Amino acid sequence: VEVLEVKITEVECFLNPEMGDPDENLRGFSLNLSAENDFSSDSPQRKMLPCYSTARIPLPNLNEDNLLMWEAVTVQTEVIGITSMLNLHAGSQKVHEHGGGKPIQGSNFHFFAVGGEPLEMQGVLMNYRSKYPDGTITPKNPTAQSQVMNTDHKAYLDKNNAYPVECWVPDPSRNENARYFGTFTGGENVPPVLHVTNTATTVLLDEQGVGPLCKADSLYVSAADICGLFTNSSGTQQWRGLARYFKIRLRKRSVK
Amino acid sequence: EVLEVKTVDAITEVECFLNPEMGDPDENLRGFSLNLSAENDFSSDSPQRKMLPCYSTARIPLPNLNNLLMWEAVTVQTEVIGITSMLNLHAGSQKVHEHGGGKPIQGSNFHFFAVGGEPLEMQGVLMNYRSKYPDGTITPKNPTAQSQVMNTDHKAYLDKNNAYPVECWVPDPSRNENARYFGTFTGGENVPPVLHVTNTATTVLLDEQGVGPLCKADSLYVSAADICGLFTNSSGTQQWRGLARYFKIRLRKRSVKN
Amino acid sequence: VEVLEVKTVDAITEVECFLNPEMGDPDENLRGFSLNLSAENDFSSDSPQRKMLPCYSTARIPLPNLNEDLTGNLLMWEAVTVQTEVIGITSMLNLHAGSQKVHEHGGGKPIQGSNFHFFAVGGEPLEMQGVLMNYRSKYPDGTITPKNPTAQSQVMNTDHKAYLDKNNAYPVECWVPDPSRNENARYFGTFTGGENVPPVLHVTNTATTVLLDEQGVGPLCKADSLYVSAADICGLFTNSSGTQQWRGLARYFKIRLRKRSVKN
Amino acid sequence: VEVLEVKTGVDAITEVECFLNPEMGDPDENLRGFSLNLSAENDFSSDSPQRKMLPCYSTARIPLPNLNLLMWEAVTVQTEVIGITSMLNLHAGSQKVHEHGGGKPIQGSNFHFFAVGGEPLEMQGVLMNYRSKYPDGTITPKNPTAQSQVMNTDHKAYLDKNNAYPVECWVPDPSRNENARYFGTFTGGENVPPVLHVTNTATTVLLDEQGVGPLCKADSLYVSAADICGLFTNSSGTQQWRGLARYFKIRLRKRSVK
Amino acid sequence: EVLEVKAITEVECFLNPEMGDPDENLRGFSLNLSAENDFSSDSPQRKMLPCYSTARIPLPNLNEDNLLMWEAVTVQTEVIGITSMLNLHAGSQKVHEHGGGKPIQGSNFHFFAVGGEPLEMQGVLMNYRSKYPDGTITPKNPTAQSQVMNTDHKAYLDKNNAYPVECWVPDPSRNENARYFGTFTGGENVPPVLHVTNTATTVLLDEQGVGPLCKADSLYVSAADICGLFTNSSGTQQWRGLARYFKIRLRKRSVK
Ligand SMILES: [Cl-]
Ligand SMILES: [Cl-]
Ligand SMILES: [Cl-]
Ligand SMILES: [Cl-]
Ligand SMILES: [Cl-]
């Protein structure tokens, strides 16, 4: 529909990570990782699989102000609790005899989105013959083509802690009413590098000065913040994730 | 000679996904190469077709037109699709140690794209001129020792998909007057892959004088190579892994003298 | 606080400060180091020694009172810019004392591994949010750590809010600056984790950070005080034996301030 | 050398292009672009490297159209390393990374350097070891002392012969080269990954603060390069330097001088 | 008071490194590093300690007859001989059987300054109980506090080859009349990364448009360029240093 003239409120929210949480005391961690399954019998357990975080954020009803819609203009966001990884005394395997614990390191994924509706996602699989567990939503009727680009695998990030990170990326051919940003760093011993500052703002307005338009007086925040692998004294490995903070500035926009 | 920009229906967007062409050794390993061999003498180097990753290319047809009118490519949005699929450490990859997770994809990688008004122009360079390339590949014809450095005979068009091996060919900086190309190669056993996705990033394709690629025959050419690293199997065999690349291109009608 | 016009002089002032690090100080001779790090404590049995936990540094700098009376425009000090650097980085080029040989007949092992470089400047104490690796850790007397933690303290638990109101008491491993508050401060930090991460530290008297927000307003010093805060964990020192210690260094601050008018 | 006005109108601009080959040592007719195997652990008192083990600076004089006063002025250069994807061949020659693995990538110490000047590059000599005995066909610092291992102002030369000046003996001289522009990056290490970019969208302006470029004496332009990509590890454990060609495209204009 | 800009001279100098020079032949190298000395008994040899380089450059007298001083406006600088490190055939331990020699690598420090008086140093020590050798100038009467900040340790860089790099840094609380720039990179395996170009200039003017002012007609250059460690065949290690070029553009400035 036709976007018209601008006619200014802040929302803030703290999205928890969904790393698998194998029992209550391991909130923020996945189950121990399995290794060396044949592509032809790869059946990962639910609690081993990090999933995308999402929340529907209700916004003030605009009935007392064609229509009006909230417009997202800017967001400030950071990963919460980065210094917790300076605890090298709890749970982690010694680097060597008499040494402290092994830092969280290895492959990591840091990702956020702000939109006027659920994030649109595309499925890609490492191994199309993976049997995903109950409580996950993964590409339906995958083929070999699902290990590169198969355009049947389209979804909405419409449920929290359901869509595994290894199965889904944001869809660049859609997401007209959202902005998203992500960096993947892969490797056995990659160091995590995380920055905090209250002086960083991201602008959400497009080439024509229009931010995401909030449908049904709601916005969707999305995140995945896999910080790396935690190595237990036994040699077992677990994903560790951290919460993400969002502060979103919005203004009223007339539409038709 | 390039004249005036034109100004209803003087703008068009086209979008597509290019699939990677890494070798596809069997019906279930689409997006991977055959296991890499090692330590072949220069005198007896005969790589199998399915071990060799190839440049991806496609020709996108644009609406016909008629001091000629041509479509001009102004901006591109591109990312690699499926970067999170590397967070599956449970399938096929060798354990990092006893009781450990699978080894992540890592090692030598190459990220490349191009947008042109005609096929990408390539220069051939070889690690080993005596390498014997298999049927189904197109490689520098009749190379010499000189072909291991610069040999100006090795000129080709990226004019066929899944045929031009990445290890044999580079974009030619002495040509490609009607195209824009971007590439980064990172070599090493342990190189971490580092990949960014956002729908807010745009490359401008216009040159110093405000002209983008002009599409001959109302056709646009997209080119890619996205080798993400090596997958290490439980046995210790390694394979290339690749991913698809998204393109969105904004074009505009431009007038040209005959 | 409704903000009005910048005054112009006798309108401008500069304060400077050297903040020492609080790495734990295990004995009289090892100022700037932690106790030997322990390893492999079960989450159900994790009681770290006071001297093993580096803490945030903080200092309160007194400023000149500006108001003849408070009876309906106040003057306040506004922080505009800061120069800051880590003091003594070249001390890590001592490879002859205490550090394990890299191999037979080799130099000592450089300081390396996980590090955290953090600073802030505010018109009030830094506001902090608690997050724990392990909510079952038993923290020692003389530290201030998240009260009544649950499993949610391993992710985000909005109950863990604190003021950095005391030097050498808030452990770096329990607390981050709170991006949901600190309306009247500016903070900057980088965490780099890994067993063999190289330290990369720059010194120059030519670098300035601007503390003004989008509206051109800097931190406003309530009660004629400026709060500086730092954490500079440089990495891990590996002794002959194989035991490791955090090493930390002091941070310089030079802050320029101007007189700003406010309503009330 | 008094500089006056930039000349104007038709035929006031020219454009030269050059593919400069690397000079890595070429130990036999088939190993064009490599060095001889690296020796190791020679005492400083008895260090006598074989010529084919020593990479040298590349250079060429490019002759320009005769003008006579007018001189050609170099204003821009586009430059690129050629064949960077050739390092994705891990099947030929190189030591396997482990049992059943691919070949070991080229990695380690690397040097990427180019220059554009209106006369030969001016160079300063600096030795790791002043007692090194250099072989026939190489040009190295004369009568070096222990001071040659730091700064000896005696060691001035012109880059006036291709494949003669060893890269280990010479650096561009920042106290001279008023009539040239040089750019280099040294990365040292046993395992450093090579990182190389290609794009036809990057230009270096060669104009100084006053807006003056290299003025081309005796209607000559001097290009210079060193592109040591890293070390190739043969399956026996021997190592060789691997070099690549460098492309130049230089835009020039006529400048008035008295 | 700093008055008006009155014309122009250029000074140049190549400042040698001071790495320890253990014998006549090993100019530009330290003595083999010792390891594992107790804090309570750490007595390093003179020839093992790299020191700061400095030189006072004499300028033309201005006020033979508002007074005039020389103002330093720009500097071009680079490290000289970076390519010498491509000699892997001399002295260095092989990387493996039949392999080339081990490149120089590990901890490095690259620093320069330009002032109109001597560089002002602050003392900080790894180990305050270190006993420093004759021929060096180090913090007087140090305490534990000398391992962090101890304001007693102030000194002018007044003597070439005397102030050990490991004991001193530029003082950011002082040096109103100099500009300094330095990077430390620590670690066993750190690669040296060095750039050369005759097209890079550092501007030395401050916020108010004023460069360093040469107090009594002299300009002071300071440097330390520790490139990393050379590993001999035996396994022993020595610092390697390189000279630094400076070209400094100066202009006449009126003062009170
Ligand atoms: Cl699906
Ligand atoms: Cl050909
Ligand atoms: Cl609390
Ligand atoms: Cl000479
Ligand atoms: Cl002192």
Tab-separated table of N, CA and C in Angstrom, chain C residues 20 58 88 120 122 124 149 156 179 211 238 252 260:
chain	number	residue	atom	x	y	z
C	20	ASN	N	44.867	2.409	38.663
C	20	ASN	CA	45.553	1.101	38.771
C	20	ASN	C	44.566	-0.041	38.518
C	58	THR	N	37.515	1.727	39.612
C	58	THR	CA	36.719	2.982	39.489
C	58	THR	C	37.310	4.048	40.411
C	88	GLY	N	52.329	1.036	30.272
C	88	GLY	CA	53.452	0.101	30.505
C	88	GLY	C	53.396	-1.157	29.644
C	120	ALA	N	35.101	3.705	30.786
C	120	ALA	CA	33.860	4.498	30.773
C	120	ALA	C	34.126	5.848	31.408
C	122	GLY	N	31.422	8.903	33.121
C	122	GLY	CA	30.027	9.237	33.465
C	122	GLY	C	29.913	10.353	34.493
C	124	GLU	N	28.018	10.026	36.958
C	124	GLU	CA	27.498	9.170	38.067
C	124	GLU	C	28.145	7.777	37.965
C	149	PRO	N	21.136	-15.727	42.696
C	149	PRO	CA	21.144	-16.068	41.277
C	149	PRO	C	20.315	-17.352	41.076
C	156	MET	N	19.787	-13.922	30.636
C	156	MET	CA	19.466	-12.560	31.146
C	156	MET	C	18.427	-12.625	32.289
C	179	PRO	N	23.428	-1.931	28.992
C	179	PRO	CA	23.067	-1.091	27.845
C	179	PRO	C	21.636	-0.538	27.994
C	211	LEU	N	32.589	12.496	23.562
C	211	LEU	CA	31.597	11.892	24.490
C	211	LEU	C	30.205	12.484	24.242
C	238	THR	N	52.317	-17.312	32.037
C	238	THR	CA	52.573	-18.765	32.246
C	238	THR	C	53.923	-18.937	32.948
C	252	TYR	N	45.468	5.537	31.984
C	252	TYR	CA	45.397	7.017	32.036
C	252	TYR	C	44.073	7.517	31.443
C	260	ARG	N	27.706	23.801	31.317
C	260	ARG	CA	26.427	23.631	30.588
C	260	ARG	C	25.307	24.100	31.510
